[model samples]
Target: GSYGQSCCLIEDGERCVRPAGNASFSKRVQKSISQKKLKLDIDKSVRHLYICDFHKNFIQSVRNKRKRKT
Candidate 1:
């Protein structure tokens, strides 16, 4: 008897952002372009500020919580 079932990407939009047979582009080239585009949108100061705030808020919460009872 079969015990597993999986939803098809073609059948679900939320499951697949880029559906099969959509656009046959090179993933490596596309990813490189995407990363470069994203980097342009991010400023240096903004990146540092986001990292510092994240460390104080979420990272500290996780690290401190692990060391002691909440």
Candidate 2:
């Protein structure tokens, strides 16, 4: 699946922050985003907090919600 090796790294902007997440799991969310074939901003954001996009099911709202809920 060529999956385990890559890690997830997203972005954050002023007044908007990309999600900070686990290295391996977040990559799943990143893959989920790509599955839609959406046009993500290609730069990968040079200097910002990490994040992701749709098909965010990878984040598993049940787990993530509980996490940031605190």
Q: All predictions: root-mean-square deviation over Cα?
A: 18.1, 10.0
List residue ranges in candidate 2 displaced over 4 A: 1-25, 42-49, 52-70
Question: What is the Cα-based lDDT of residue 12 in candidate 1?
Answer: 20
TM-score winner among the candidates?
A: 2
> Per-residue CA lDDT of candidate 2, range 1-70, in tens?
4222222343232322344343333345456546544343323334332444321344444345444542
Provide the lowest-lDDT 10-residue window in model 2. 2-11
lDDT of 1 by residue, 1-70 (tens): 2221221221122332222222222334335435434221222222211212222233234334455553
Q: Model 1 Cα RMSD, Å?
A: 18.1
For residue 29, model 2's alpha carbon misses the true position, in angstroms, by: 1.4
